[PDB]
Design a protein around this motif. Sequence first.
Motif, mmCIF file in Angstrom:
data_model
loop_
_atom_site.group_PDB
_atom_site.id
_atom_site.type_symbol
_atom_site.label_atom_id
_atom_site.label_comp_id
_atom_site.label_asym_id
_atom_site.label_seq_id
_atom_site.Cartn_x
_atom_site.Cartn_y
_atom_site.Cartn_z
ATOM 1 N N UNK G 110 0.845 -1.182 0.000
ATOM 2 C CA UNK G 110 0.000 0.000 0.000
ATOM 3 C C UNK G 110 0.883 1.236 0.000
ATOM 4 N N UNK I 50 -5.780 0.126 4.902
ATOM 5 C CA UNK I 50 -4.706 -0.732 4.331
ATOM 6 C C UNK I 50 -4.970 -2.120 4.905
ATOM 7 N N UNK I 51 -4.519 -3.209 4.305
ATOM 8 C CA UNK I 51 -4.741 -4.613 4.773
ATOM 9 C C UNK I 51 -6.161 -4.946 5.222
ATOM 10 N N UNK I 53 -8.707 -4.932 6.951
ATOM 11 C CA UNK I 53 -9.500 -4.292 7.995
ATOM 12 C C UNK I 53 -8.622 -3.472 8.946
ATOM 13 N N UNK I 54 -7.672 -2.721 8.401
ATOM 14 C CA UNK I 54 -6.829 -1.869 9.226
ATOM 15 C C UNK I 54 -6.891 -0.432 8.735
#
Lengths: 312, 164, 164, 164, 312, 124, 124, 124, 108
Positions: G110, I50-51, I53-54
């Motif tokens: 990300x 990001x990721x 559920x973060x």
Amino acid sequence: GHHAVPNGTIVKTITDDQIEVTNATELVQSSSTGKICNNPHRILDGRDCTLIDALLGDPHCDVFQDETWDLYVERSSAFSNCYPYDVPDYASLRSLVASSGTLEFITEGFTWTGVTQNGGSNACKRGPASGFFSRLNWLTKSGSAYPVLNVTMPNNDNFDKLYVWGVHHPSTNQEQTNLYVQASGRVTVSTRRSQQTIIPNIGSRPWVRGQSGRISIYWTIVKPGDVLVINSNGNLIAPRGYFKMRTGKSSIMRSDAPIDTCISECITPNGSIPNDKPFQNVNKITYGACPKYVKQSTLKLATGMRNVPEKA
Amino acid sequence: GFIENGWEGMIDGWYGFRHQNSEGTGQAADLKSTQAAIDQINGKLNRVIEKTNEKFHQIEKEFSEVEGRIQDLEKYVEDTKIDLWSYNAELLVALENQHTIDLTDSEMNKLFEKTRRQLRENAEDMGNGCFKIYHKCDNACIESIRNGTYDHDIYRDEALNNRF
Amino acid sequence: GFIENGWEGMIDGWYGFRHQNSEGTGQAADLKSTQAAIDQINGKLNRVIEKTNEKFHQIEKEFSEVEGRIQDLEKYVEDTKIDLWSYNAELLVALENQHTIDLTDSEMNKLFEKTRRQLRENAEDMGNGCFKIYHKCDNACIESIRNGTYDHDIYRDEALNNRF
Amino acid sequence: GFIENGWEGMIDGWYGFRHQNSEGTGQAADLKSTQAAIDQINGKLNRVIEKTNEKFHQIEKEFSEVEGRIQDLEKYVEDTKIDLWSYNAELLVALENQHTIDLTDSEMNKLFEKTRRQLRENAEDMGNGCFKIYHKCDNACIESIRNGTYDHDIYRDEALNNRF
Amino acid sequence: GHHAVPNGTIVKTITDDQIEVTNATELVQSSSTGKICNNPHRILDGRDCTLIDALLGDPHCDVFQDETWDLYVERSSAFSNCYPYDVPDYASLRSLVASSGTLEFITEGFTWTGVTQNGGSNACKRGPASGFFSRLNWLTKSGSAYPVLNVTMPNNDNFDKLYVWGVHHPSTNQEQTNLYVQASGRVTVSTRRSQQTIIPNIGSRPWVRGQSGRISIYWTIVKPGDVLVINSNGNLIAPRGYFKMRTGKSSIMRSDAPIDTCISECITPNGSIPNDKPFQNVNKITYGACPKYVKQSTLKLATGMRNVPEKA
Amino acid sequence: VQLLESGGGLVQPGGSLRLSCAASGFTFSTYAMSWVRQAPGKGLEWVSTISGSGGSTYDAESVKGRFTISRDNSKNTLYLQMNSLRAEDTAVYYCAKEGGDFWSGYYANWFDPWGQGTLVTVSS
Amino acid sequence: VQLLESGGGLVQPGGSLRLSCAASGFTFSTYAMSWVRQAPGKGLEWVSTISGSGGSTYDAESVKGRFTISRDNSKNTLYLQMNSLRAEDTAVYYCAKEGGDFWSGYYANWFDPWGQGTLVTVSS
Amino acid sequence: VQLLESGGGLVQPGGSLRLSCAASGFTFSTYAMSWVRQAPGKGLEWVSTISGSGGSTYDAESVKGRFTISRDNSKNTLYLQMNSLRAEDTAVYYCAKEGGDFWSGYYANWFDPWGQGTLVTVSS
Amino acid sequence: SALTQPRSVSGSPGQSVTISCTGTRSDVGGYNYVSWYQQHPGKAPKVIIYDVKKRPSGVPDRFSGSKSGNTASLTISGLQAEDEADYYCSAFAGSHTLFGGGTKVTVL
């Protein structure tokens, strides 16, 4: 082939105590900042008074009146500066009031006939003059009589009322007949479901702030629809009202750490600890969202493979 | 069990290849296998880290005076709770570590197994984690091995002759 | 999964070989693989055995008279503690046993895998845990297989002819 | 790691084969490997399910009035017991699930490994979980592969010629 | 190749929160039928009386006399219709009697000399006439005297006897001298190993069914070979006998669920739950063989492999 | 447990010698045995080891083709045979017993009891 | 953290252009970097990424043989080179940083900070 | 659940016979079915079994090439066909249902309901 | 190819809005590296999840993410005016990063 690092970490596993891995993360929080933060929770610093002293109305902490909290921090330097007293169940009253979370007091109209109110002692010096606990009313004889008091106060609200009253155990029999009239007094406080009856005991006791007598503090809870009847022919430290009782997230903590400005979810007597880690070793006493307590000093989780330097 | 070393200097991933063809020695890093291992380790860490313990009012754990049964029972309860959670902390760490080692050793064999199947009868295992390709490999041919687009039929005839 | 028996009479180790060459039947035991398995089982036992529970003064667990809340709470606490530790005892034994079985089966495959790589294209797998060497092996050649110093090139030409 | 799909339409077992010979496409299901996996999953379920908790008289857990130390201690004990058993419930489910996934993937590789050893040098792995038999297989020959009675010597000469 | 299903289930594991599997089974019982079954255990429905009221002999539940049980179901609609009373240790007497499992009463021959027995009050109206608890005997003056009672009752059996007695706290001093004679009464019940002395307290209390006084209920256990001596000069609600004491699988439950006819091994205040599953989320209060209580709402065990639709 | 060594003496270079270690006080057929030598003034050097049944023998590289080991589990005696002796073989030879009780009979991981030792010397 | 892009401008089709992204406020040699383009009015499209040491470069298929990526960890600048430019390459190019701190330096899962972007245009 | 057998009768050696087992009270396409025979006075012998869809059939060695099994899930009937009958085939034939509810439809691990049985006899 | 996202989603203030980013088995179902970016008009994108559920440090807790097989969902709770922007989803496909088409959220 795979990668290797020059400086690996030792990690425990089922087979053996030490295996080197590329990297690992500590799972035990073993450090504290040494200070308590006040942003997410309401912290109340009882610098010189205990919860019971603030509840009873000690002269030197009138600042704590009608004060709510999410955590009462009790300091080891707390001291009492009023008439000597004891509570037969100190831990119960401390726990009950602390979990209530409010020292809110609504003064009821109590009609005492044939007695003199607003008594006081030199032990509690409110300013230059002798005084008493602000939330307790001392009753003495009116002339040469102590009529048997039979007062009542019903419940029409929708919350539980906590009544704090007391019995005065005088040092000598002359003091009893000088203050009250009956040689042997009696105090009975009863609701429709529970009764509490206490006969004062006459005797000399250690000398505290000039007084050889003591006061025994008791509490009674009145539920909605209930009624409270106070009956006594002597030795009654009458209540001035009731404290409103609430349930919630409120507790008391004994700490000496100072209070600062930050945002920490859990509070420990050694300070505020971060909450990211799963386990902690700082203290077994905690308040809020914080890791569990473990005996272990360290616990490393392997975020990597074996670290053999220069199935598969 | 055939790789008996760790390549320090592999700084673009956890797994990869190095070759010695006629052009010269080269080095490369695998990325599908590396992120698979990191994702699983990352997922393990998140599950351990979750904060679900929220306690507000509990019993008193330190005592100033000396009392009888009630004080001893309170000390017994807290000691029992601490020992149980301390044991759970040790077993959880021990279990998740052994899974991490096995997870990482498996991902290397998985990469080795798929590279073996790619060179169908054009290479021989050489004991350690290296193959001997029996035909002239240039840089492009080695790249196709890492990409996944290695055609084993164009080099097959000349490989089988060299092998036998 | 290919070995479907256990050689009773293998009394000098946990793993080993037996052969039938022109000289005659022989038997031998591997020692690197045996001590690796024993060390890991020994390390597992030590971790379980460690004595870290030292309790001196606890609550009373047997009662003569009949009391109320305090006696019942004491009985509840001890019963809760016993059930939790009894469950931990079962899971620990179950977990460490399943790891011991896999570990021991893995060590046999690891020995089989390394012996397979040693006879590079000079032997073929025969389903069960035995190889068919396609060249004349004497006692010394079989010993070099166990030692780890088997040269697969001297026997390669005559092995490939017999195979095909 | 080579099978990258799941055959919906395999409704007579958990594992099996499908072939494309000169006669035509066929489908079959393995039964030794299927019942081995089901038995182990069935045995796991029975061990979890056993009912060994039988409690008759315990402490009071709901309170109408407000009391002091004794009431708080009772609430602390029950909260401690619930958190410990809730953690045990999560770890047990997590552990037994990861073993079920690994025990089902292993049973597929075990079937693949034994089919590979059966076609000794008569077939080539083709990356995915399929073999290329280098000789004319009829329906009976494919059946002998599933039965376990495949003679690799009758087809060996014509297979080795096609391979090379 | 392996099989796949079109509709798989999501299951938790160590690596990740969600993996699809072919099938899974729930390991948490989160449902109740809403009714209590009575086949494997003996269920006794205390519709309108509590255990203490049935033990004491309330006029409106004489049906519960000599009634055994395996689980006493207490309803929130239970009410008292006798002389107002309190028990200093209510939870202890409730727990002790409930685990006994029998309200069996054997009337002993108690000789009280110089007092009038079978006293009663308008609060307990047994039919048209005033009455009292059936298992407690009220003693009043006989003419103009209350002789100091010194009764004894030894143990020659092989079981423990539970004696329930009481002390009457009258509202006014005139009531005391009208009922008994001594201005200050006293009741002492002692065995060879334990003693219990209670001095009644005089005072007004809330008005319950016309009576401003109360009764304090106490209990004493006599082991085999022991002896019980009752000594009092006033304010004694004498016992009429003893209750047989037994140990076994018996408890008390507070529920409002109705009782039906089925075969369920465990009982919960929300009803009876099936026992096949290892964990349950219905209630933390349980009786019998039933799953453990967990905070989790669901817990799925994977009875199958991964479910990839269209190491190995 | 008691291990007694014998056979030490003076042997010319290239000669032969046979050392016997009589062991009493334990089941001789259960535990592995080893020979360890220490040159005068220098450190300890491992020589050989033998399994419980006697079928497995392990030798050091500087000893491999020259010295052999054997047992007679009936007589509870451990034998080491010297075939070709060099000038560097002058040392004190100890017979040791596998001190472990965990799967004993395969190899000697540690040596709990040791003999007093027999000194062999080679010279002109 | 601050990423500043430069080099955007008008280029004839088939021409070349070089974009520089100056990064300050973090250790540039630890984190992976990427180029992401967004055509005017359309969505986001990934272009390239580079590892911490610069040895590993990953490119998109529509960019693979034409645009290349590079770093100069000494100068803390990220460079993208355009070699053969088509009519579909007109977009706003952003330089992004791997926002993760878990084994950073391999790939950009990300992109936490983004630059303001430089617009390149091709036309007659 | 109820299984009813039919077709039993006298057949000359080398003849043929067809047995039908009509099953009602359960989903016939979910559970595996089997044929089990018991010779007069002797023990029980397994004959054949069939999967839920009918695609998988399993036969005993003494029956393998002679008797076949089949289903018609539409008609909820189980059929066993006898092709070559010998003197040892005289027995009482039962049709049984897989009693398990755990992944039912593959094989019959145990047989919860059994039919009353049909007796077939061969003779001159 | 590319991830599939709806053209637009609209909701009244105070409601909940879910954006679906459907991918294949190598993009979303093979990893947990799904990310969500919010792009205001004429501005560089910013991370919200990001990721799977973060959340980063500095994002309202209204935003939430989840994964269900091959589809990843972003839930915006307490929808308000400052949430009107284009939302993109990113995924890791083994050898490249894939971006979604883009969903424009309009607040009524």
